[PDB]
């Protein structure tokens, strides 16, 4: 049951990607439209890169229906359906119109769906099923890409048409809407429950009609009972009946007692003494029993809280370095595999490309599924180590090919093995990412971590090209094999924190060392501001009024500053871990 939900939700997250990039370009090329210089385009791609920007809204606000995750999912999906149907109805026959604008809107909705789906996956899945869920979601997303790319395009070419294709996709998205309506909802208690407590308590102060005292007090009582059993922040690790947990329970016990007293007064028809009872409740609220509370009721907290959560932990920078460079070898192989097969070896483009497509698809799916099953049967760290070693070793198939003869079977075998190991590593990586989140700020943290993982993959092109054009292909692939060692070293460095999180299920809190972590955070913030200024300058340059050459220097200066901050943070993190070891 749950696995079907994961599969269909991954299908949904993968469905809307192609219509803004490939099918739209095909539609323009058929109708003799260039789709260039429209000034709204080139932002459809930028939605997916910068989807981490509007993340805090997804976890700060709880919509007044379903839950926090499911309500957002339904709103995003229905917005997507309306937008896609509108896109189908729009006819570029007269002129381009705002078609790029609608495409930008659809891209934004799809990015929001991705954020919320990742957050829900992180929230609902248990520790053992993380790998299986990641594998099934990956399977669903690849299936969505497959159906959107070729099948729908062929159907529009032969039977349905460009007019009916988008209605078909909307009709296909509807069943996933009822699926997420049927989907389970996780639990989110403390901050939200105390927020509804405070809202109804403030409503009690304005209560004058003698009837909304009772209903308000009922809401407060249900919220207090729910929040009694949840755990507060900084007490997550002291979960199994700790004295501080006992005092938490004692305070909520007294709070519910005062609520019952006020409710007893209000059932008697009194109002003024009920108001005095709520005032006494608020007075005892202010006392020292108030030890833990929530992030909301302020705008600044909705943004600042996830960052402080993540960067207050221990192992915060080593995990960052691991995420940046774990799948480097696969990126180095993929960057020029096809160029190698076309020029480095004498193979035709068409059949070889198609067979590579099929073999890579099947092999990565099989690798992901097998890794998911093995990780269900194993610990996370051991599976990560095994799969990293395997994906590092499998790259040597291409060195073997480049030195060996020109038979197709050897190339097929090497491709199959490489994509299998890639799928295994992908499943383990997504499991690690889902482990690392917080279930309170899961959306923001997961989006930031995914973008951070892609950042390391982005800058591989020029170096790979220079190496392959300078020293050759077999040397390039031996180097690519030798490049998978840093990820394994990072995995072996931080195994203690991984096993601690596997056992206690809670991340620790850093306390040692001076305020050098603050200096590193300041460096990172300065680098981010410099990157934002550079992006704004590039946006202004897009108007072609004035061009500058020092932006290249500014970008690399900002990158060096950010990387220096990250490396200093990581060395401090490792030193602290070896200090608590010693």
């Amino acid at each position, epitope marked *: 049951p749950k696995s079907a939900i994961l599969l269909i939700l991954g299908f949904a997250s993968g469905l809307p990607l192609a219509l803004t990039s490939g099918t739209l370009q095909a539609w323009m090329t058929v109708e003799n439209i260039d789709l260039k210089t429209i000034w709204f385009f080139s932002l459809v791609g930028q939605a997916y890169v910068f989807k981490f920007l509007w993340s805090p809204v997804m976890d700060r606000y709880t919509p007044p229906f379903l*839950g926090r995750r499911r309500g957002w999912l339904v709103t995003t999906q229905i917005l997507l359906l309306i937008a896609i149907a509108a896109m189908g109805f729009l006819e570029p026959g007269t002129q381009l119109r705002w078609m790029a604008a609608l495409a930008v809107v659809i891209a934004f909705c799809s990015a929001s769906q991705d954020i919320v789906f990742d957050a829900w996956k992180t929230d609902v899945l248990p520790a053992e099923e993380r790998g299986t869920g990641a594998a099934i979601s990956v399977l669903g997303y690849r299936l969505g890409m497959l159906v959107s790319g070729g099948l729908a395009l062929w159907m529009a070419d032969k039977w349905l048409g460009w007019q009916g294709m988008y209605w078909l996709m909307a009709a296909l998205l509807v069943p996933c809407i009822i699926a997420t309506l049927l989907a389970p909802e996780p639990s989110a208690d403390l901050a939200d429950n105390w927020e509804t407590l405070n809202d109804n308590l403030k409503v009690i102060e304005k209560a004058d009609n003698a009837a909304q005292v009772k209903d308000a007090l009922t*809401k407060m009582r*249900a*919220a207090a*009972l729910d929040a009694q059993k949840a755990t507060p922040p900084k007490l997550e690790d002291k979960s199994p009946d700790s004295p501080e947990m006992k005092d938490f329970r004692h305070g909520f*016990d007294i709070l519910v007692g005062q609520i019952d007293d006020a*409710l007893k007064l209000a059932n008697e028809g009194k109002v003024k003494e009920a108001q005095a009872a709520a005032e006494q409740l608020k007075t005892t609220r202010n006392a020292y029993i108030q030890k833990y509370l929530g992030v909301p009721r302020t705008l600044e907290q909705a943004v600042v809280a996830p960052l402080r959560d993540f960067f207050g932990r221990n192992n915060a920078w080593l995990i960052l370095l691991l995420i940046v460079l774990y799948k480097l070898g696969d990126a180095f192989a993929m960057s020029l595999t096809t160029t190698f097969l076309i020029r480095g070896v004498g193979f035709d483009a068409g059949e070889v490309g198609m067979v590579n497509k099929t073999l890579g698809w099947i092999a990565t799916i099989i690798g992901a599924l097998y890794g998911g099953v093995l990780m269900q049967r194993l610990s996370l760290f051991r599976a990560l180590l095994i799969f990293g070693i395997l994906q590092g070793v499998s790259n040597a198939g291409y060195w073997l090919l480049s030195i060996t003869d020109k038979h197709l079977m050897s190339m097929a075998v090497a491709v199959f093995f490489e994509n299998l190991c890639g799928g295994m590593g992908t499943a383990a990586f997504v499991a690690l990412l889902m482990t690392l989140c917080n279930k309170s700020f899961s959306a923001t943290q997961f989006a930031l971590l995914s973008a951070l993982s892609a950042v390391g993959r982005v800058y591989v092109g020029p170096i790979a090209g220079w190496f392959v054009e300078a020293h050759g292909w077999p040397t390039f692939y031996l180097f690519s094999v030798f490049a998978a060692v840093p990820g394994i070293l990072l995995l072996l460095i931080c195994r203690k924190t991984l096993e601690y999180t596997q056992q206690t299920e809670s991340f620790m809190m850093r306390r040692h060392f001076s305020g050098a972590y603050q200096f590193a955070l300041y460096l990172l913030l300065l680098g981010c501001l410099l990157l934002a200024l550079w992006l704004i300058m590039l946006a202004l340059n897009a108007i072609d009024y004035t061009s500058f050459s020092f932006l290249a220097g500014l970008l690399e200066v900002a990158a060096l500053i950010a990387i220096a901050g990250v490396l200093l943070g990581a060395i401090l993190d490792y030193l602290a871990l070896r200090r608590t070891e010693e």
Partner: antibody
Amino acid sequence: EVQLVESGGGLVQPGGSLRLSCAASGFNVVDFSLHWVRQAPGKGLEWVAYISSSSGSTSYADSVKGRFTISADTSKNTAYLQMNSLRAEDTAVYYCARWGYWPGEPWWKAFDYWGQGTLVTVSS
Amino acid sequence: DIQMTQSPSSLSASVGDRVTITCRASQSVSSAVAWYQQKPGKAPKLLIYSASSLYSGVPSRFSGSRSGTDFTLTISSLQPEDFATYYCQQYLYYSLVTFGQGTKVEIKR
């Protein structure tokens, strides 16, 4: 030697008044709030009234308010439910359940001990 | 007065099959739901309290769980003695006590 016995069915005027007693042996009525629950013949349960003698609190359901009155005496270790101006729909089996004090596990095991029931039937 | 629209509304299963009963609270109630079994001609007995916790005296066959505002009662191995009426009661406050409808399923053999 532990039990909770209810009594009170008898011959009264139709649409008149009648008092029921719930005497509990093995535990005092001070320590547990006493609730009267009615089940109609063939239909489901519904909570009718409650009295708590620790604070003197008392409450009645909306569909019965203003006509019933539930009292108790702790020296005799029993509670009473006096029903006046009865209507045809009132006939049912009355159980006298108990509920523990907040806080603790006594509150959470609501209506842990029940009663054999008394058939209060109103008719002419 | 608002319930989810469902096409399959009835059940038909034989002896020895795992069975489940569900009820949904209209608003948030916390984990204050109890499950009672009443055999014909007797006062109801307390099967489950807190929707998941259990005291002494009851067979380990019965279990309960909660998700959101849904509460479920599970029986693993159906027995000849399990045929009675089953009530879920929310008992949030002393005065706001409400009972469920009740579910009785007959004998399959």
